Amino acid sequence: TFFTDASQLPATVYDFIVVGAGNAGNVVAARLTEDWKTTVLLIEAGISHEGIDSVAVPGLVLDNLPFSPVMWNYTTVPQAALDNRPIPYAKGRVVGGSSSVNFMEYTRSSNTEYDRWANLTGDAGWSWKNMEQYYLKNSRLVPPQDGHNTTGDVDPSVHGYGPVPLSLVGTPNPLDARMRAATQAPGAEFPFQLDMNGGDMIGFGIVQSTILNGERMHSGKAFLEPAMSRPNLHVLIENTVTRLIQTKTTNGLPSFMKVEFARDALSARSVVTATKEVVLSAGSIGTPQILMLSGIGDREELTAIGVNVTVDNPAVGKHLKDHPIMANYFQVNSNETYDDIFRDRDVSNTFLAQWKQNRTGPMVASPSTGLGFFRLPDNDTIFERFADPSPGEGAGHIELILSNQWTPEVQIPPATGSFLTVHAVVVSPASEGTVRLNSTNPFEFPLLDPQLLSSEFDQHTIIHAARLARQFVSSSPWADFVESRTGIIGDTDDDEADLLAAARQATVTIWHPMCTARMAPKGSTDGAIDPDLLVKGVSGLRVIDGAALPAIPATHPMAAIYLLAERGSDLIKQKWKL
Ligand SMILES: Cc1cc2nc3c(=O)[nH]c(=O)nc-3n(C[C@H](O)[C@H](O)[C@H](O)COP(=O)(O)OP(=O)(O)OC[C@H]3O[C@@H](n4cnc5c(N)ncnc54)[C@H](O)[C@@H]3O)c2cc1C
Ligand SMILES: COc1ccc(C(=O)O)cc1
């Protein structure tokens, strides 16, 4: 159990205040309290994860979308490159944050991802050489729930000892064997990847999910729950941080050591104080919104909104990156898909009962079976006009995600039939957008503009990815299984203009907003924070979450965020000699 009101807290002063009990924030709160002395208050806007089946049970993940108590739901402004469609945005609003509601897929990214962080920041502490220790500390490989033989599908030698457990799936599907046969063959057009967490992601690999004993092990399970028996950790839920309040100058810079919060817009505000640091872990949307409302951000833009600006930090809310996705649906000559589970609540409930009984069956599966990462050819024409937006070697421009059902996105499954989805993702997008305030009201929705598919690079690449999906399933292991294409993209012929017009209607965000208070070198205004994660122009304020990353990962970002939080935690311990 958690505190739900300020009046319950044992103190109003703490060594550290961490805002956001999410993917990163729970890492920070748990790591910092490991000495059993350092006091931390963790403040979270959302509800407890406890007792919620749609969080604990992997197979129920789609039930939280598009709208549920555990999810923050909003939409983008009209997206100019997507036929002016406003696109749904979701993020977690629960203990564990987005790790409690996400699709559980853990991919640390290529070695070159971390090397790129080093190059962008000028700080070799973010290089893979130095980051490998934080990967091994974060996660470990565990056996599949069903004890099936994973030989050839994972490499135990590239996994560590940490609290986040990764497993291959504990219930079978018809995709894995076809994926292996299509990709492991001599001369396969799409190669096989033994272990995408071993430094090179290129090829199709069997997904590795944050699931142990058939249960989702989100950051609230891996980090927070174990740490909550400590006397020096206190967790306040159901309270939104409204702004930071400026306190005394420290080292010649303004500090913001007071944290104001409230249960809701009509509730009386309370204030707590940190004596060492405030850490913002409110995510790529929440963290810039707090900074802006605190008067830390673009002076001109914030003044126009009526914020009293205290630190001109123009990168705040800029450089928003996200991954566009569009589904390629195929009807399949199979009765082994999960479509009946999605469509029929009685079916779902019966498999839920099996899960509650002995943690087996379809409910232990994540929403994907396999992930494939591919590069455009080096000698490809588009790189005349575009620099490589990827980390380089071992990272893709494109991801193809295999799902053993019609994954709902823009469209939901037809009432009849069995489906495969091959999702086309641009994992190295060139498009960039913003998060801005609408209002000085802290409870008002932000203005979200990812500029999805605005770059011609992203348009070209997502269309190319749709063609790759169709080519992937044309090989002989897929010949008896895939029967035809359907849905927006699938019904479209191969012509580029036709596919682009379809992409403008089928594309959505995968919900990986990133880089809105990003690291940059000291003296650069290309980012909001320094390479040590401390906010530029401020003393005592650190950002540890998706907002901090200087580039969007070329893959599912939960793991890179975990690793950033692992190192950030150590940077705090080092500075304060904990
Ligand atoms: C549906 C979905 C599926 C996804 N699937 C995957 C996948 O399979 N694999 C993967 O790698 N990534 C996936 N992602 C992305 C990944 O989950 C996120 O990029 C990552 O978890 C974000 O980490 P974070 O710590 O930056 O933010 P979050 O985990 O979102 O944490 C932010 C926390 O701060 C809280 N908060 C925000 N504002 C305030 C405030 N003002 N006051 C107090 N608290 C506040 C939030 O409620 C939340 O708990 C998915 C995302 C979603 C939404
Ligand atoms: C349908 O499969 C997936 C899996 C992961 C993600 C994601 O990382 O958001 C999206 C779709």
Residue numbers in the entry: 2 to 579
Task: Cite, word for word, the article reporting this structure.
AAOs are flavin adenine dinucleotide (FAD)-containing proteins capable of catalyzing the oxidative dehydrogenation of nonphenolic and phenolic aryl alcohols, heterocyclic alcohols, as well as polyunsaturated aliphatic alcohols, into their corresponding aldehydes. The active site of AAOs is enclosed from the outer environment by an insertion that creates a loop over the active-site channel. In the reductive-half reaction, the alcohol is two-electron oxidized in a concerted reaction involving a hydride transfer to the flavin N5 atom and the abstraction of a proton by the catalytic base His502 assisted by His546, resulting in flavin reduction. In addition to this well-characterized oxidase activity of AAOs, a simultaneous quinone-reductase activity has been reported recently in PeAAO and its homologous enzymes from P. ostreatus and Bjerkandera adusta, as well as in Ustilago maydis AAO.
